[PDB]
Amino acid sequence: QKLQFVLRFGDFEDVISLSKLNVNGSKTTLYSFENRYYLYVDFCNMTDEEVENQLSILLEYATESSISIHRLEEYGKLIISEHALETIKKHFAS
């Protein structure tokens, strides 16, 4: 089962919101593309049950884009690497 996903938020504030929680053993990176912001999640080693779980939360705040992840790595716009959630929580939660 796959352990890396790419999600699209409609408006940026949706991302801040997500940030205000716990990323947890979750490397994550954030792109800007077609004016909408995509976010790329990478779970290292988790039980499938544990991931289908976690991913649930994420999509309270996003949807999952059919977007080829390498389209971003090439033709996107990087904004924050590896610790993408973590950084937004810094500059935005209060």
Binding site: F9, G10, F12, E13, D14, I16, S17, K20, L21, N22, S32, E52, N53, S56, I57, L59, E60, Y61, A62, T63, E64, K77, I79, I80, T87, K90, H91, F92, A93, S94
Partner: protein, 437 residues
């Protein structure tokens, strides 16, 4: 995002109660779910009690996936997911004729948009998604010889249909009705053709016979007789009749012909009927006419009040009586190129919206803040992809000051519902006319 039951509204605000009781900052689908099982009395609440899901079992899974608790509570808002979930319950009720959303529909609406935290609470509490939509369902429900064929829809049975006590008034055209019966007995010019300027009244005359045969005074053999209404199903059903004949047909718009039985009441215009008898002569024979005088002015009035209740559907009427008096009288002499019962009704409608319309209009010189507001967000975006966070977060803390700003003059516009919500009197009616004359 509209109006639901108390039970809905309470359950929703109740999500917020739970928003904070755990300290989180956005209320997602997981809180809407706590909301439902925690008002413990909604159909939604009831169902959960079925699957084996008390508040106890649930909140334990949820805290086991989020927990405290930034008391931030900086005037919170929804998850985009849950905003979808709300948009959905509205539809999970269009899909049920339920004129208003409530505890169930919101539970219905959650399953539908299964991607989210609620959904996982349950696929975790060993409760697949469909076993659940079921439980809600099993707590809501519904409301003859040749009729078999006929009884498509095509073409609904005026008679038994209004035998079920289920019928209203109905105001005539009381002597319009009885002339439908001198004819619907004959053996001469037998089948009556209903000519009059269109409408309304017209459909109401046949809803008459219906009312008359049933309760009950009528004559020259006419009891247990239905009045029925409205190509690859054509003369098909029509044979269930050449084999049993308790039936008048009510037409709207053709003649597959008096090959025998076929009792029908004619929907046609001053002239449209002359589009039958000229080619002749089933007309001067079978079919035979009668006119719809425009219903009595006073009768006209007490016709609306009956459907007053039913347009209350747009918010203002019922009432005012003083409001209808208008509609009707204006028409009879002041243009004055229709029929005295149809016109009035139309007028209401102009206003039968034109008021919920004027109700949801736009605030003062408060346009230019929107324009300001716009570029700030914009200015915000550009910098975040440049990052430049602080140099923007500035800009977010700043867009948002303007947000709650404009609201308190748009929510300050339920200050504008009052100045017309359910206000009704001629005031609104006649200005309508300054145009039509």
């Amino acid at each position: 995002f509209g109006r639901f039951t108390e039970r809905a509204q309470k359950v929703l605000a109740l999500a917020q109660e739970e928003a904070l009781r755990l300290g989180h900052n956005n209320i997602g689908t997981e809180h809407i779910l706590l909301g439902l099982v925690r008002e413990g009395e909604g159909i939604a609440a009831k169902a959960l009690q079925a699957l084996g899901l008390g508040s106890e079992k649930i909140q334990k899974e949820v805290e086991s996936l989020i927990g405290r608790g930034q008391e931030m509570s900086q005037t919170i808002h929804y998850t985009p997911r849950a905003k979808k979930v709300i948009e959905l319950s509205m539809d999970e009720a269009r899909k049920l004729g339920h004129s208003y959303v409530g505890t169930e529909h919101i539970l219905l609406g959650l399953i539908r948009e299964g991607e989210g935290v609620a959904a996982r609470v349950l696929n975790n509490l060993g409760v697949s998604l469909n076993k659940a939509r079921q439980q809600v369902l099993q707590l809501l429900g519904s409301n003859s010889n040749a009729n078999t064929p006929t009884l498509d829809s095509l073409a609904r049975d005026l008679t038994a249909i209004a035998k079920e006590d289920s019928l209203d008034p109905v105001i005539g055209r009381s002597k319009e009705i009885q002339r439908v019966i001198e004819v619907l007995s004959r053996r001469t010019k037998n089948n009556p053709v209903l000519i009059g300027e269109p409408g309304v009244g017209k459909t109401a005359i046949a809803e008459g016979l219906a009312q008359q045969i049933i309760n009950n005074e009528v004559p020259e053999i006419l009891r247990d007789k239905r009045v029925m209404t409205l190509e690859d199903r054509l003369k098909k059903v029509m044979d269930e009749i050449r084999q049993a004949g308790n039936i008048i047909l009510f037409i709207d718009a053709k003649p597959s012909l008096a090959r025998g039985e076929l009792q029908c009441i004619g929907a046609t215009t001053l002239d449209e009927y002359r589009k039958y008898i000229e080619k002749d002569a089933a007309l001067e024979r079978r079919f035979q006419p009668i006119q719809v005088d425009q219903p009595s002015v006073d009768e006209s009035i007490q016709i609306l009040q009956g459907l007053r209740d039913r347009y209350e559907a747009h918010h203002r009427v019922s009432i005012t009586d003083d409001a209808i008096e208008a509609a009707v009288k204006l028409s009879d002499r002041y243009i004055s190129d229709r029929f005295l019962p149809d016109k009035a009704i139309d007028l209401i409608d102009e206003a039968g919206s034109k008021v919920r319309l004027r109700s949801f209009t736009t605030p003062p010189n408060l346009k230019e803040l929107e324009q300001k507001l716009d570029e700030v967000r914009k200015e915000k975006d550009a910098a975040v992809q440049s990052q430049e966070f602080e140099k923007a977060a500035s800009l977010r803390d700043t867009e948002q000051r303007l947000r709650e700003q404009v609201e308190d003059t748009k929510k300050s516009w339920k200050e504008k519902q009052g100045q017309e919500n359910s206000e009704v009197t001629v005031d609104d009616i006649a200005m309508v006319v300054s145009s039509w004359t």
